[PDB]
């Protein structure tokens, strides 16, 4: 990947503060991207994926909301070394953004969500990643679909940034890295996918909001 300092300070930071969405294409290069693809396909082939879940579960099936199957990756697992390198490269960019992404203080993140929409028209209805203050402030997604033709296979991530005259269509392009504010400024949907679609997400936490959310959880 490119030098983290310049990419963070001269592109990611201004793009995020002005637009709340930032696309970095050709993030890791073809070789590393293909190694990540092989690791993800191996997770898929060995039965690691389970139905994607929601923050709050009511009467409805999760599959009426999101049709993907996922697994959580810490980064040090055998067979996930290149996913780990991806996560460390994401983290390096974020660390070089310290104190420049809005008013957030980013001290931590989730594990990586490796997610697959297995074609068949699966998608994710319009939603907000963090609508009620669970600590998530930045969503970071890496796409790894070599040969994706969105005009036939669908799977576009459509974001509706608040206050803007146009929505943002993000094709799940090979080696594309995406950042966006996780809060209600960026409702978004994964449009139906007609081929197997892979992406890896980490969510970065704002320290004070995440502390408040942990307190709420630990007190009931």
């Amino acid at each position: 990947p490119l030098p983290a300092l310049k990419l963070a300070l001269e592109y990611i930071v201004p793009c995020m503060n002005k637009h709340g969405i930032c696309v970095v294409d050709d993030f890791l290069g073809k070789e590393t991207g293909q190694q990540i693809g092989d690791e993800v396909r191996a997770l898929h082939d060995t039965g690691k994926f389970t139905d994607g879940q929601l923050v709050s579960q009511k009467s409805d099936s999760s599959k009426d909301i999101r049709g993907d199957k996922i697994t959580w990756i810490e980064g040090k697992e055998p067979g996930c070394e290149t996913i780990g390198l991806l996560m460390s490269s994401m983290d390096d960019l974020i660390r070089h953004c310290n104190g420049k992404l809005g008013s957030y203080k980013i001290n931590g993140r989730t594990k990586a969500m490796v997610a697959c929409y297995p074609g068949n028209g699966t998608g994710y209805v319009r939603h907000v990643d963090n609508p009620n203050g669970d600590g998530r402030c930045v969503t970071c997604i890496y796409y790894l679909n070599k040969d994706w033709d969105a005009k036939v296979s669908g799977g576009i991530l459509r974001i509706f940034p608040e206050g803007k005259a146009q929505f943002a269509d993000i094709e799940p392009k090979f080696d594309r890295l995406l950042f966006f504010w996780s809060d209600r400024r960026n409702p978004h949907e994964v449009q139906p996918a007609y081929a197997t679609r892979y992406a890896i997400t980490v969510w970065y936490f704002d320290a004070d909001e995440r502390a408040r959310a942990k307190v709420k959880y630990l007190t009931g």
Binding site: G52, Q53, L54, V55, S56, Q57, K58, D60, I65, R66, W72, E74, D91, I94, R95, I106, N107, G108, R109, T110, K111, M113, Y124, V125, R126, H127, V128, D129, N130, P131, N132, D134, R136, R184, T201, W203, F205, R210, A213, K214, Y217
Partner: peptide
């Protein structure tokens, strides 16, 4: 209005979280 947490992608609230 709808409780948007019913559409939001789950994350663990327990355990640590990874520290940067």
């Amino acid at each position: 209005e709808l409780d948007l947490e019913t559409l939001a992608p789950y994350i663990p609230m327990d355990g640590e979280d990874f520290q940067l």
